[PDB]
Design a protein around this ligand. Sequence first.
Ligand SMILES: OC[C@H]1O[C@@H](O[C@H]2[C@H](O)[C@@H](O)[C@H](O[C@H]3[C@H](O)[C@@H](O)[C@H](O[C@H]4[C@H](O)[C@@H](O)[C@H](O[C@H]5[C@H](O)[C@@H](O)[C@H](O[C@H]6[C@H](O)[C@@H](O)[C@H](O[C@H]7[C@H](O)[C@@H](O)[C@H](O[C@H]8[C@H](O)[C@@H](O)[C@H](O)O[C@@H]8CO)O[C@@H]7CO)O[C@@H]6CO)O[C@@H]5CO)O[C@@H]4CO)O[C@@H]3CO)O[C@@H]2CO)[C@H](O)[C@@H](O)[C@@H]1O
Ligand SMILES: [Ca+2]
Ligand SMILES: [Cl-]
Ligand SMILES: [Zn+2]
Length: 510
Amino acid sequence: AKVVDIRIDTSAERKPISPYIYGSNQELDATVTAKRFGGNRTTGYNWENNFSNAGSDWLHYSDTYLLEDGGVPKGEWSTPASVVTTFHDKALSKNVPYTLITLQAAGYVSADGNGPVSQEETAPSSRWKEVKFEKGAPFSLTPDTEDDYVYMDEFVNYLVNKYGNASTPTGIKGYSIDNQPALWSHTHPRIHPDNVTAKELIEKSVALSKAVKKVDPYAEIFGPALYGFAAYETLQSAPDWGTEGEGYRWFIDYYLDKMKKASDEEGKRLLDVLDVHWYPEARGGGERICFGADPRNIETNKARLQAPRTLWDPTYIEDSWIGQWKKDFLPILPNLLDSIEKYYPGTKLAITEYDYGGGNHITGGIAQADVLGIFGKYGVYLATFWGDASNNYTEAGINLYTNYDGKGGKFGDTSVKCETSDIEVSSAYASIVGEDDSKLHIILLNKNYDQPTTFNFSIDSSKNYTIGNVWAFDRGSSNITQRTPIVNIKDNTFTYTVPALTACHIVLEA
Ligand SMILES: OC[C@H]1O[C@@H](O[C@H]2[C@H](O)[C@@H](O)[C@H](O[C@H]3[C@H](O)[C@@H](O)[C@H](O[C@H]4[C@H](O)[C@@H](O)[C@H](O[C@H]5[C@H](O)[C@@H](O)[C@H](O[C@H]6[C@H](O)[C@@H](O)[C@H](O[C@H]7[C@H](O)[C@@H](O)[C@H](O[C@H]8[C@H](O)[C@@H](O)[C@H](O)O[C@@H]8CO)O[C@@H]7CO)O[C@@H]6CO)O[C@@H]5CO)O[C@@H]4CO)O[C@@H]3CO)O[C@@H]2CO)[C@H](O)[C@@H](O)[C@@H]1O
Ligand SMILES: [Ca+2]
Ligand SMILES: [Cl-]
Ligand SMILES: [Zn+2]
């Protein structure tokens, strides 16, 4: 019999949970609170004609994938930024509060959709148009597809026009400075063959932020969208990190420091959100927990259930080069947040890309649930998952927070102290709505693989809870079903045993 005590103090550690941590990049069979238009294809995207390059993902084709994959109407395929408007209309039509858009920064964008771009056609060539941030002239809601340029600030304008600015309801709140620059020369060699440098990146960002913050002072700028650890530390061995990184624990500090400095010189904040991508290197059972990992492998599934700990748990060492050789930077969330504090306070933090694998397995769903619990508890501002609708259990973890009863029910927005006696076998997050603890929401995850877990809840609230309804999903179905309610609460205390590998959302009320 595995017994664990859960302790909650509805009046301690009260912190708001950003509503934007529950987002996605792809369209999911779930309720998400933010949609991001980013990733490899977005780097060479041309708003004037909607053409883009698959880069190395696929023979360097310039084509209409984004119009196809986006579900755009062939009528609009020629309409400027149709791809992005279609993207935002769909978003708005689902009452999704936040739309992040990626702006082109690598330097060039598809001039056509004629297909393959020969190495000989490496930019600049007739296959591309040169991207420029500021137009230095009057914008036109009818861009000139014939010139040799594409203006980013004019791009925002076309948008801020159609939807109003970032302060308006229907407006687009965020803009990202491209996608994974440290990998530009790997993913888009036909656009930026040389390895981006620390100076170049900082320089282009500042340029782009200003260009944009003059078309919409209220818009939020995300950056740099680093693909993974290597870019966090040295911008993937940037050619000038040796000189630039002088006296910097890692590139993250450097970026935050220079963006800050630049912001002081400009007289206004240029960096709104530090944006990084996080794909667990956490290994188990021979393979990595994500990127095509086999759910038959019980050892990897078990490694996945513990992987989330790397985000906050200072006592957890995952099996990976990062756990093995990067302990000075783990847990990663505290370190990233810790860095924001030293070189640019007030700066938000977003994990615009992440996937813990097992998307169609119970553990994929518990990990996702646990990850979402961590983002809210540590102040993450926005998070958009990467993966499609086949990930039924991942979609399950998200709904546990955004729509657990199928009718719009959701986790509270104010996190409260909530401790577990055994973090290895379980996880628990608790919240209330605003400053009112009349209803205490609790996410309770039983990581015990094949044996049940009994939980002893002792809550310290101003209210007396007499009932506790339950919703949950498990190895039985990725569908969240209501369960028998808790009714024997004595002085805000009860015992609830939960089946193996189960994720539930409890809701207590007086
Ligand atoms: O096909 C359908 C349509 O597709 C369309 O295009 C799609 C794509 O299909 C879709 O995938 C894409 O979605 C993308 C998204 O757009 C991207 O944002 C991103 O994709 C990225 C990944 O994020 C990225 O990870 C991946 O490659 C990574 C890889 O994942 C990493 O694992 C790897 O990391 C390396 C690391 O660099 C290396 O250094 C490390 O080993 C070192 C370690 O770094 C070092 O520190 C350590 O040092 C120790 C040392 O070991 C020790 O001895 C000594 O004593 O101490 C020192 C420390 O002091 O040593 C170790 C070695 O021991 O190893 C790791 C790997 O294990 O890096 C690579 C990159 O290089 O790349 C992709 C992009 O290519 O996410 C999504 C994909 O997941 O969306 C597209 C559309 O937008 C087409 O357009 C259509 O046409 C198609 O139809
Ligand atoms: Ca043009
Ligand atoms: Cl990067
Ligand atoms: Zn699905």
